[PDB]
C-alpha cells in the first residue's frame, strides 16, 4: 500500500517540475509530428487521377500475310488506348484500318470507276488496238497488197493511160467529186472510198468498231471529274503536298505523320499511349554507321538491327530440321521477290525511255498527227497542251514524270539490298551455337537460336509430337524463374517498350514461323488460316503517383520519429544516476521497484499523447485513406511499450550521461539495419527466419509497416478481418505476428534490464554476485564503559583506490554509542568522507565490515536504510523545486500526513533561519542557505542514525547558533555522527571525540580525557595593533614555555602561584598591544600537537610571443583532457564510422546467381482459370472441324494426349453444358426495358471524387446473362460466348471477378488469361495471278519493250507471290498481359489446334502436337531493369547512413564548451587574459583536426569496399573535398548554441536531432519534386528551393552524396551498350557550386560566433562609488549603494551575515554579471567600459571550485603560468614555490578531480596568485581547511601584504579576520553598517570578560559576586556567561566548586550580538 503512496508522490514531483518548463515538454510531444509535414503537403500537391477505359488494336502475325504483318508493325508501335471499341473486336472483322485515306480512295475507285456502265467497251478498244498493231501497223515482214509499207506507200498501178496536179494533190488530201470529172471511173473507182473512217477498209474478222472510241469518252467524262473532286482525293493531295517539294521531308517529325494518316487511320488524334563492315556495300555500311552514331536514332536502331540483319542458328543437321526450316522461310522468300521486282527496273527503264523517245507508234504516229479534225473532235466533247506538254522530242526547258521515277526507284533498290534474307546456319551442339552467338552479339547480329532436342543428326522422319526450344538472350525475353508480379497492381500492363518484349524482341514472330513450318511439314494439305492477336480490354481505374514514394519512405520516416524520445529518456535515466539523485531517494527509504514503476508510467503517459496526435494527423491528412484508426493506434502502442523497455535496458550500460547521449541514437538506429537484406533476399526469406530476426524491436516495426502500406496499395485496409493473413502469395508472418512479437521483446528486454541492474551498478553502489538468485531471504583510547549500547560499529576497514595506490582508509576500529553526539576530526586527506560514504552504501569497501544495528550492510542495506538520514559534504538538491516543497516532499516520503507535514515544515523553517524565502527555487539561494537547507532536511521525518558531515562549513557565527540548537533538540534518541573542522563546536557539544590520521585512529574519548592525554595549561593572548619587551615582560613571572605562535597582527603565550599569575594580569592591565584573554586549554592546541621566493615577476611576455604562448597552453590543456577520457573519444569519434561500416558490410551479402530454367510454355502455368471461345462465321466448312478439335477431342493444348504429357498435370472427366441460374430481378430487367445494339447493358459507375474506389461498382446488370459453361478435362471452365458482345462482357465483368478471388485466399488473383475466337475475314485483292502477267506481257508487246534476262526471273514467281500477301480466313487469340507468359502460351494453343484441324481423316488428331520451351542463352547476366533498380535502391541507403553518421559528430564538440562555461572555468581564463578571439580560434583549430579523423576513417572504408562512384580515380578528390569542407562549414555553427544550454548532454541530443532533421528533410524534397516533371507548379518550387536551401551545409552534403551515386549508374548502364562517358564531377552544376557555398558559410558563421561572444562579454586601488544590483525577478536590491577605497598595503575585511551580497559584489567587480547604476575603478580603469584592462591587474578566487577535474594539480599551475607572462624557462620554479608554500606536496599530481575538498581550496588559492597582481580578491579561501593549513595561508597573505599589494577577504571564521585584517565592514542586506578598524568595533560594542564555565547552583553563583551580568546562552553541560568589568574574575576563581575561561572580547561574540539587534 505504501508502494502506491510513494508512486503518487514521485509522480507529483515530476509533474510539478514539468509545470515549469512548458517548452522542453511541448517540443517533446510535437517532435514526431514534424517529419510528416512534407508528406502531408506533398499528398495534397497530387490529387488522385482516374483513368478512362482502354481498347487496343490487334497485331497480325507473320502467318497472316506479309502486308498486314508489316502494316501492323508500323501502325502499332506505341500500342495506343482508344476508349471506344475498335472495329477489330467485332464478330467477323480483323481489318481495323479504315479512315485511312489510301483505303477511302480505293473505296471511291470501286464505287465510281469500276463495276459500272462505263467499263464495258474499254476492253474492246484495247483488243481492237492490238489487232491494229498486229495487222495494219505491222505489215513489213508479212505479204500484202501494194497499198502497204512500214511507213507509207501507194497502190497506184494497173494503168492503161498516158502520163491540175496542185489542184488534185490538194483535193485528195469525194465519192461524187470524181464522178463528174470525166477514164478512171471504171478501174480505179471500183471500190474506192472517201477520206471517211477507213477502219472498215481492212479485211478483219469483225466488221468495224470505230466511231465509238471517241463516242465512249463522253460517257465516262462526268465520272473522272467527279472522282477527282471527292473529299478523299482532296485529303490525299493536301497531305501529299510536302513530299515532292524539292525532295525530302523533315526526318522523323512530319514524315511519320504523313505516312500515318496515309496508311494507318487511328482516330481521336492517334491514341493515348498509356568500322568498315564486310560482305556489304559502301552504301549499306555508310548508312548503318551514320544511323548508329547519331544520338537520336541509336535507340530504335539498337532494337531493329537484329531482325533486319541478324541470323538464326539451329542446332542439329538432319534432313528433318532442314525440311522444317525450308518450309519456315516463306516470309523471307516473299520478301526477296520484292527485291527481284524492283531490280527489274534497271532494265525496263531505258526501254521505256527509248520507246517514248523514238517510236514508230509515238514519234512517228502521235508526233505525226491532221490536227484540223483533231481540234474539232476535242472541241465537240488541247493539242498544244498535249503534244507539246508531253510529246516534245528536243529539250525545251514529259520528263517531269520520268526523271523522278528513276530518282525514287533506284534509291529504293539501293536501300533494299542492305537486308539479310538468308539467315539459317546449322551446327552440331548447343555449345558451338553458344560461342557463335557470343561472337555475334557484339555486332548486334543475333536473332534467336532454335534447338530440336529429340532428333539425332541422322533423323529423317518426324515423330507426331515435335518439341523445340528458342534460346535468346535475357534482355529481349521475359524472365523464366517467375511468372507474375509479386504484388497485384491495378493497371493493364500495356507499355510498348518494357511490357512487350515477346513482340519487339522477335520471339513471337519466330515461334509463329516455326510452328507453321512444323505444321506444313506433316500435313501436305494445310489450311491457309492466319492468326491475329488481340489484348483484352480493361475497365476504368484510379492512378496513384504516390505509393511509389510512399512505399520507399514510410518505414524510415516512421521509425525515425522516436529517436528524440529514445535519446531524451536514456539520458535522463543516467543524469539521476551519476548526479547522485537516485541515492538520496534510496537513502530516504524509497524502494528500488518504485523507481522503475515511476519511470515507466511517466514515460508511457508522455509517449501515449504523441501517439494520439500522430494517428490523428496520419488519418485526417489522407496519407492512409482505407485503413482503420484503432488498429494503427494499437500497433503504435505496442511499439511504445517495446521502446521504453529497450531504453531501460540501455541505461544500465552507461554511467556518464554524456556517454549515453552519444550512443543511444546510434544503437537504436543500428538495430534496424537488417532491413537492408530485404533488397536482395526479397523472396528467399522464410516466416521462421522472419520470426528469428524480429526479436529486435525496430525490425518488427518495419515488418508491420510494410503490411500497413501494402494492404492499401491493393485497395484495402487493415480491417479487423485480414490481420493474420498476408497480402503476398504463400507467405506466413502476417501483421498480427509483428504486433505479437513486439510484446515478447518488451518482456525479454525488461526482465534482462532488471537482472543486469543488480549485477553492474557502476560507480555508485554495491554489486551483487552474478548468482544472487540463491535466495538468502600514555594511553590514547579511553576505556570502554560497559554501559549505554553501541550503535554503528566499524571493524577493520580498508579502501584502496586503484590509481593512487595508497590506502585512503587503513584498518579502522570505531564504535558510535547510541544517545550522544560524536565529533569526527582529522586533517584534510584523512578519510572522513571516504569512511562516511561506506557507512551508507555509496561505495563498497575493500575489506572489513560495518554494523548499523548489529546487522552488517554487506547483506542488509534495505532494512538499514529504513531509518537513516544524511547530508553530504557538497550540496545536492532538486534545483527547480522550492524550499517549502523540498521540506514538504521529504517529510511525506518517510510517511506522514499532509497537515502534520505542514506543521513540521512550519516549525523547521523558523528554526533554521530559512523563513522569508519559503518560495524561492533552490537555485536562487546563496550557498550558506543551501548548506543550511541540506541540514534541515536531514532531521525532517524521523531517523535513528543521523550521519551528517561538514554541517557548518559556510555558515556565519550568528546562524551556527541555530544549527547547534537544532542538533541539541534531536539528540534525544538517535546516534548522531558529526565531521567538522573548526573546534569551537567539536568540544562544546561533543559527547565523544575521535581523531583520524592517515586513515586510522590516533586518539579517542571524551574531551577531558584528551586534554590530560596530551597536555593542559593557560594561554595568555596579546592581540597587537616589540617582541623583546613582551618576552622580557613575561620573564618576571617566567613559567614554562613562551611564544608558541606569532602571525600578522596576533600573538600567543603559554603559561601553566596565584600571586605570580594574579600579579601579571593585574600589572598588565595598567601597563603596544590592545586587548587579551586568558583561558584553560583550547581543543585546537591538542589537535595541533597531533598532526605535527617569487615576490616580483620581471618581464611578463607581450605581443606575438604572448599569443603564441597562449595557443600552446590551450592546446596542451585540451590534449591532457582527452588522453585521460578515451572512452568518450572512442564513442564520439569512432562509433559513427563503425555504423557506416556495418551498413556497407550488410549490402555485400547477396544470394548467388543461378541460371534461368526452361519453363515449358502452356496455359496451365497459372492455376484454375476461365477461358472462352466464340465460333463466329458459322456454316463455313473447315471451321466446324476446327471448332470441334479445340473443344471436344483433344481440347485446348496438349494436356490430354493419347500417350502422355508431363505427369504433373493429370486429366479427368468433363461435365455437360449448363447455363447457370440468375436471380429473377435480372430476368425482368433484361426483357422488360428495351435496350439497343450500342447499349447492351447498364454502365458501371467509377471512383467518384468523394467515393474513392479501386475499381468501379458495376451494378447487378453487368454485360448480360451468364453464358453457358462447362468444365473441361483440362480442369478449366470455358464459357461459350457465341453471338454476343465480347468487349462489353469482359469489361463489365472484370471487377466482379476480381472481388470473388480474395474471399478464400486473401491475396487478389487474376482468373482469366485468354481465349480463341474462330472466324474473321478480310477482303483480298480480286486481281488473280496469270491474268496480271498476261496483261503485262501484252502491254509490253504493244510498247516494244520485250523485257530482258532479269525480267524472266522476276515475272516467273508472280502467281505464288500474290498468294502470300493476304489470307482471307483466320482466327484471333485474346490475351491478358498481367500474366507474363500468357501471349505465347495461347499462341501455341492456336497453332496446335490449326495443325489438328487439317490432317487427313485417318490419323486420329489426338496424338499430334507441338510444344515450345524458352531457355535464355547462358551469358551469366541479369536483365538491366533488375540490376539498375537494385543498385539505386542500395546506394540510396548508403548515402542516408553517411548523412546520419556525419550528423552526430559535429555536435560532439559542444560538450566541452558548455562544461567549461558553467563552473566558471572559462571566465577564470579570461581573467588571466586570453582575448576571446584566440580562445575561439584555438578551439576551432582543435575541432578541425578532431573531425578529420572521422572523415578519413569513412573515406578509408569506402576505399576498402571498392565502391565505385566514390573511390575511382576521377571521383575520390570530389568525395574527399565534400567531407573535409563540410566539416569546416558546419563546426562553427554549433558554437552559438553553447551559449544557451547549461547541461552538455541536453545540447548534444537536441543538436544531433536538429541536424538530422534538416539533413533528411532538405535532401529528399528536391529529389522528390524533381521526379514529378508532369506538374508545372512543382518546377517553380524546385528551382527556387535549390537556391534558397544553400545556406545549410546539410543540403550541400545531401545533394552531393546522392549526385555522385546517380551519375555513375547512368554510365554503368552505357557500359551495357555503346560507349562509356567519364564523369569529371567538378562542374558548376554537379557539386562545384556546393563546394563554393561551404567556404563562404564556414567563414560567415565564425564571425557570427565572435559577434555573439560580445553581447555576453589617489594613492589607492579599487575605488567603489554608489553601485547597485537588482536581480531581474525581485524588487529589493541585492547590493544597495555602497562605496569604499582600498590603499596599497592594507587588507579589507568584508564580513557579513549569511545572504548579504558578498559574492554579488565580487561578481560585479570581476565582470561576471552586469552592474546596475554605479561605477568602480581598479587602477584608473573603469569596469563599466574597459574591463580587459583591469583583468590583468587582479587575481580572483571563486567561492566554488572552478577547476578541470581531469588534469592534475601541477598542470593547472603550468597552464596558468603560461596564460600570463613568466617565460618558458622560469615556470618550473614558480610552480614549485606555489606547490610547496600552500602544502600540496603529497599529491601535487593526482587528477584534481580526486582531491579531497579541502585540497581544492588550496589549489584555487594557489592559482589565484600566479603572476603578482596588485589587487587580490579572495572569496571564502578557507572553508574546508583544517587548522594546520589555515596557518600556511595566513603566512602567505602576510608575506604578500608586506610588499605593497592589496587583499580583500570574505570569510566566516572570525579567528582569522582578527589575525590578519586591518579594516572591517559588517554588511547587512544592502550596504555597510559599520566600517573601521577592529578596535573601533570592540570598544563601542561590548564591555568584556565573557566568562565561560562548563559544569541553578551556578546560576545563583553570580548573585553578589557579579551583579551586572547578562546571560548569553544556556546549553547542555556547557554554558556561557557575560560578567561586568570587575577585573576580579581571577580574584573570585578560588570560589569555583569545569573549564576555566575568560577573555576581554572575541570578535566572534561581537559579531553575534552585532547582528542580533537589527
Ligand atoms: N541568480 C539569482 N537570482 C535571484 N536572486 C539571487 C541569485 N543569486 C543570489 N541571489 C540572492 O541575492 C542575495 C545575495 O546573494 P549572495 O550570493 O551575495 O549571498 P552571499 O553573501 O554570497 O552568501 P554567502 O555569504 O553564504 O556566500 C541573496 O539573498 C540571494 O538569495
Ligand atoms: C471501314 O471501317 C468502317 C468503320 O466502322 C466500317 O464501318 C466499314 O464497314 C469498313 N468498310 C469496309 C471494311 O469495307
Ligand atoms: C530529268 O532529270 C535528268 C537527270 O536524271 C536530267 O538529265 C534531265 O535533264 C531532266 N529533264 C529535263 C527535261 O531536263
Ligand atoms: C546452361 O546453363 C545451365 C545452368 O544449370 C546448365 O544446366 C546447362 O547445361 C547450360 N547449357 C549450355 C548449352 O550452356
Ligand atoms: C430485385 O429483385 C430482388 C429479388 O431477387 C428483390 O428482392 C429486390 O427488391 C429487387 N429490387 C432491387 C434489388 O432494387
Ligand atoms: Mg570530506
Ligand atoms: Mg557567497
mmCIF file with all atom_site columns, N, CA, C and O in Angstrom, residues 1287-1310:
data_model
loop_
_atom_site.group_PDB
_atom_site.id
_atom_site.type_symbol
_atom_site.label_atom_id
_atom_site.label_alt_id
_atom_site.label_comp_id
_atom_site.label_asym_id
_atom_site.label_entity_id
_atom_site.label_seq_id
_atom_site.pdbx_PDB_ins_code
_atom_site.Cartn_x
_atom_site.Cartn_y
_atom_site.Cartn_z
_atom_site.occupancy
_atom_site.B_iso_or_equiv
_atom_site.pdbx_formal_charge
_atom_site.auth_seq_id
_atom_site.auth_comp_id
_atom_site.auth_asym_id
_atom_site.auth_atom_id
_atom_site.pdbx_PDB_model_num
ATOM 1  N N  . UNK A 1 1287 ? -16.492 -7.456  -76.044 1.00 0.00 ? 1287 UNK A N  1
ATOM 2  C CA . UNK A 1 1287 ? -15.888 -6.286  -75.416 1.00 0.00 ? 1287 UNK A CA 1
ATOM 3  C C  . UNK A 1 1287 ? -16.730 -5.743  -74.282 1.00 0.00 ? 1287 UNK A C  1
ATOM 4  O O  . UNK A 1 1287 ? -16.183 -5.184  -73.331 1.00 0.00 ? 1287 UNK A O  1
ATOM 5  N N  . UNK A 1 1288 ? -18.039 -5.882  -74.360 1.00 0.00 ? 1288 UNK A N  1
ATOM 6  C CA . UNK A 1 1288 ? -18.899 -5.493  -73.263 1.00 0.00 ? 1288 UNK A CA 1
ATOM 7  C C  . UNK A 1 1288 ? -18.804 -6.464  -72.105 1.00 0.00 ? 1288 UNK A C  1
ATOM 8  O O  . UNK A 1 1288 ? -18.651 -6.041  -70.953 1.00 0.00 ? 1288 UNK A O  1
ATOM 9  N N  . UNK A 1 1289 ? -18.849 -7.757  -72.400 1.00 0.00 ? 1289 UNK A N  1
ATOM 10 C CA . UNK A 1 1289 ? -18.819 -8.777  -71.362 1.00 0.00 ? 1289 UNK A CA 1
ATOM 11 C C  . UNK A 1 1289 ? -17.545 -8.687  -70.530 1.00 0.00 ? 1289 UNK A C  1
ATOM 12 O O  . UNK A 1 1289 ? -17.603 -8.600  -69.299 1.00 0.00 ? 1289 UNK A O  1
ATOM 13 N N  . UNK A 1 1290 ? -16.384 -8.674  -71.186 1.00 0.00 ? 1290 UNK A N  1
ATOM 14 C CA . UNK A 1 1290 ? -15.121 -8.694  -70.454 1.00 0.00 ? 1290 UNK A CA 1
ATOM 15 C C  . UNK A 1 1290 ? -14.948 -7.443  -69.609 1.00 0.00 ? 1290 UNK A C  1
ATOM 16 O O  . UNK A 1 1290 ? -14.595 -7.529  -68.426 1.00 0.00 ? 1290 UNK A O  1
ATOM 17 N N  . UNK A 1 1291 ? -15.204 -6.275  -70.192 1.00 0.00 ? 1291 UNK A N  1
ATOM 18 C CA . UNK A 1 1291 ? -15.003 -5.021  -69.476 1.00 0.00 ? 1291 UNK A CA 1
ATOM 19 C C  . UNK A 1 1291 ? -15.933 -4.933  -68.274 1.00 0.00 ? 1291 UNK A C  1
ATOM 20 O O  . UNK A 1 1291 ? -15.507 -4.582  -67.170 1.00 0.00 ? 1291 UNK A O  1
ATOM 21 N N  . UNK A 1 1292 ? -17.213 -5.258  -68.459 1.00 0.00 ? 1292 UNK A N  1
ATOM 22 C CA . UNK A 1 1292 ? -18.153 -5.089  -67.365 1.00 0.00 ? 1292 UNK A CA 1
ATOM 23 C C  . UNK A 1 1292 ? -18.166 -6.260  -66.394 1.00 0.00 ? 1292 UNK A C  1
ATOM 24 O O  . UNK A 1 1292 ? -18.893 -6.206  -65.404 1.00 0.00 ? 1292 UNK A O  1
ATOM 25 N N  . UNK A 1 1293 ? -17.397 -7.314  -66.641 1.00 0.00 ? 1293 UNK A N  1
ATOM 26 C CA . UNK A 1 1293 ? -17.320 -8.408  -65.685 1.00 0.00 ? 1293 UNK A CA 1
ATOM 27 C C  . UNK A 1 1293 ? -15.972 -8.523  -64.985 1.00 0.00 ? 1293 UNK A C  1
ATOM 28 O O  . UNK A 1 1293 ? -15.874 -9.254  -63.997 1.00 0.00 ? 1293 UNK A O  1
ATOM 29 N N  . UNK A 1 1294 ? -14.935 -7.829  -65.448 1.00 0.00 ? 1294 UNK A N  1
ATOM 30 C CA . UNK A 1 1294 ? -13.652 -7.915  -64.750 1.00 0.00 ? 1294 UNK A CA 1
ATOM 31 C C  . UNK A 1 1294 ? -13.731 -7.536  -63.275 1.00 0.00 ? 1294 UNK A C  1
ATOM 32 O O  . UNK A 1 1294 ? -13.186 -8.285  -62.443 1.00 0.00 ? 1294 UNK A O  1
ATOM 33 N N  . UNK A 1 1295 ? -14.362 -6.424  -62.872 1.00 0.00 ? 1295 UNK A N  1
ATOM 34 C CA . UNK A 1 1295 ? -14.388 -6.094  -61.440 1.00 0.00 ? 1295 UNK A CA 1
ATOM 35 C C  . UNK A 1 1295 ? -15.033 -7.151  -60.569 1.00 0.00 ? 1295 UNK A C  1
ATOM 36 O O  . UNK A 1 1295 ? -14.413 -7.606  -59.608 1.00 0.00 ? 1295 UNK A O  1
ATOM 37 N N  . UNK A 1 1296 ? -16.255 -7.575  -60.882 1.00 0.00 ? 1296 UNK A N  1
ATOM 38 C CA . UNK A 1 1296 ? -16.928 -8.564  -60.048 1.00 0.00 ? 1296 UNK A CA 1
ATOM 39 C C  . UNK A 1 1296 ? -16.155 -9.870  -59.975 1.00 0.00 ? 1296 UNK A C  1
ATOM 40 O O  . UNK A 1 1296 ? -16.362 -10.659 -59.052 1.00 0.00 ? 1296 UNK A O  1
ATOM 41 N N  . UNK A 1 1297 ? -15.291 -10.130 -60.948 1.00 0.00 ? 1297 UNK A N  1
ATOM 42 C CA . UNK A 1 1297 ? -14.429 -11.304 -60.905 1.00 0.00 ? 1297 UNK A CA 1
ATOM 43 C C  . UNK A 1 1297 ? -13.226 -11.093 -60.010 1.00 0.00 ? 1297 UNK A C  1
ATOM 44 O O  . UNK A 1 1297 ? -12.737 -12.048 -59.405 1.00 0.00 ? 1297 UNK A O  1
ATOM 45 N N  . UNK A 1 1298 ? -12.710 -9.867  -59.942 1.00 0.00 ? 1298 UNK A N  1
ATOM 46 C CA . UNK A 1 1298 ? -11.543 -9.620  -59.109 1.00 0.00 ? 1298 UNK A CA 1
ATOM 47 C C  . UNK A 1 1298 ? -11.889 -9.634  -57.628 1.00 0.00 ? 1298 UNK A C  1
ATOM 48 O O  . UNK A 1 1298 ? -11.013 -9.901  -56.804 1.00 0.00 ? 1298 UNK A O  1
ATOM 49 N N  . UNK A 1 1299 ? -13.146 -9.351  -57.268 1.00 0.00 ? 1299 UNK A N  1
ATOM 50 C CA . UNK A 1 1299 ? -13.598 -9.401  -55.882 1.00 0.00 ? 1299 UNK A CA 1
ATOM 51 C C  . UNK A 1 1299 ? -13.791 -10.824 -55.393 1.00 0.00 ? 1299 UNK A C  1
ATOM 52 O O  . UNK A 1 1299 ? -13.419 -11.143 -54.261 1.00 0.00 ? 1299 UNK A O  1
ATOM 53 N N  . UNK A 1 1300 ? -14.344 -11.687 -56.235 1.00 0.00 ? 1300 UNK A N  1
ATOM 54 C CA . UNK A 1 1300 ? -14.608 -13.077 -55.913 1.00 0.00 ? 1300 UNK A CA 1
ATOM 55 C C  . UNK A 1 1300 ? -13.355 -13.912 -55.829 1.00 0.00 ? 1300 UNK A C  1
ATOM 56 O O  . UNK A 1 1300 ? -13.440 -15.139 -55.926 1.00 0.00 ? 1300 UNK A O  1
ATOM 57 N N  . UNK A 1 1301 ? -12.192 -13.285 -55.680 1.00 0.00 ? 1301 UNK A N  1
ATOM 58 C CA . UNK A 1 1301 ? -10.937 -14.006 -55.605 1.00 0.00 ? 1301 UNK A CA 1
ATOM 59 C C  . UNK A 1 1301 ? -10.234 -13.892 -54.268 1.00 0.00 ? 1301 UNK A C  1
ATOM 60 O O  . UNK A 1 1301 ? -9.319  -14.680 -54.012 1.00 0.00 ? 1301 UNK A O  1
ATOM 61 N N  . UNK A 1 1302 ? -10.617 -12.949 -53.413 1.00 0.00 ? 1302 UNK A N  1
ATOM 62 C CA . UNK A 1 1302 ? -9.949  -12.777 -52.132 1.00 0.00 ? 1302 UNK A CA 1
ATOM 63 C C  . UNK A 1 1302 ? -10.799 -13.193 -50.942 1.00 0.00 ? 1302 UNK A C  1
ATOM 64 O O  . UNK A 1 1302 ? -10.357 -13.032 -49.800 1.00 0.00 ? 1302 UNK A O  1
ATOM 65 N N  . UNK A 1 1303 ? -11.991 -13.742 -51.175 1.00 0.00 ? 1303 UNK A N  1
ATOM 66 C CA . UNK A 1 1303 ? -12.806 -14.235 -50.071 1.00 0.00 ? 1303 UNK A CA 1
ATOM 67 C C  . UNK A 1 1303 ? -12.144 -15.419 -49.379 1.00 0.00 ? 1303 UNK A C  1
ATOM 68 O O  . UNK A 1 1303 ? -12.119 -15.496 -48.145 1.00 0.00 ? 1303 UNK A O  1
ATOM 69 N N  . UNK A 1 1304 ? -11.594 -16.348 -50.160 1.00 0.00 ? 1304 UNK A N  1
ATOM 70 C CA . UNK A 1 1304 ? -10.968 -17.552 -49.627 1.00 0.00 ? 1304 UNK A CA 1
ATOM 71 C C  . UNK A 1 1304 ? -9.485  -17.334 -49.342 1.00 0.00 ? 1304 UNK A C  1
ATOM 72 O O  . UNK A 1 1304 ? -9.036  -17.484 -48.203 1.00 0.00 ? 1304 UNK A O  1
ATOM 73 N N  . UNK A 1 1305 ? -8.718  -16.987 -50.370 1.00 0.00 ? 1305 UNK A N  1
ATOM 74 C CA . UNK A 1 1305 ? -7.308  -16.653 -50.232 1.00 0.00 ? 1305 UNK A CA 1
ATOM 75 C C  . UNK A 1 1305 ? -7.191  -15.142 -50.299 1.00 0.00 ? 1305 UNK A C  1
ATOM 76 O O  . UNK A 1 1305 ? -7.585  -14.539 -51.296 1.00 0.00 ? 1305 UNK A O  1
ATOM 77 N N  . UNK A 1 1306 ? -6.642  -14.532 -49.252 1.00 0.00 ? 1306 UNK A N  1
ATOM 78 C CA . UNK A 1 1306 ? -6.762  -13.084 -49.125 1.00 0.00 ? 1306 UNK A CA 1
ATOM 79 C C  . UNK A 1 1306 ? -5.947  -12.318 -50.154 1.00 0.00 ? 1306 UNK A C  1
ATOM 80 O O  . UNK A 1 1306 ? -6.082  -11.094 -50.232 1.00 0.00 ? 1306 UNK A O  1
ATOM 81 N N  . UNK A 1 1307 ? -5.102  -12.983 -50.933 1.00 0.00 ? 1307 UNK A N  1
ATOM 82 C CA . UNK A 1 1307 ? -4.409  -12.274 -51.995 1.00 0.00 ? 1307 UNK A CA 1
ATOM 83 C C  . UNK A 1 1307 ? -5.263  -12.228 -53.255 1.00 0.00 ? 1307 UNK A C  1
ATOM 84 O O  . UNK A 1 1307 ? -5.909  -13.210 -53.624 1.00 0.00 ? 1307 UNK A O  1
ATOM 85 N N  . UNK A 1 1308 ? -5.280  -11.071 -53.901 1.00 0.00 ? 1308 UNK A N  1
ATOM 86 C CA . UNK A 1 1308 ? -6.077  -10.871 -55.105 1.00 0.00 ? 1308 UNK A CA 1
ATOM 87 C C  . UNK A 1 1308 ? -5.479  -11.681 -56.243 1.00 0.00 ? 1308 UNK A C  1
ATOM 88 O O  . UNK A 1 1308 ? -4.263  -11.869 -56.321 1.00 0.00 ? 1308 UNK A O  1
ATOM 89 N N  . UNK A 1 1309 ? -6.335  -12.170 -57.130 1.00 0.00 ? 1309 UNK A N  1
ATOM 90 C CA . UNK A 1 1309 ? -5.940  -13.116 -58.157 1.00 0.00 ? 1309 UNK A CA 1
ATOM 91 C C  . UNK A 1 1309 ? -6.551  -12.705 -59.487 1.00 0.00 ? 1309 UNK A C  1
ATOM 92 O O  . UNK A 1 1309 ? -7.530  -11.968 -59.541 1.00 0.00 ? 1309 UNK A O  1
ATOM 93 N N  . UNK A 1 1310 ? -5.958  -13.183 -60.568 1.00 0.00 ? 1310 UNK A N  1
ATOM 94 C CA . UNK A 1 1310 ? -6.465  -12.970 -61.918 1.00 0.00 ? 1310 UNK A CA 1
ATOM 95 C C  . UNK A 1 1310 ? -6.919  -14.325 -62.431 1.00 0.00 ? 1310 UNK A C  1
ATOM 96 O O  . UNK A 1 1310 ? -6.109  -15.251 -62.527 1.00 0.00 ? 1310 UNK A O  1
#
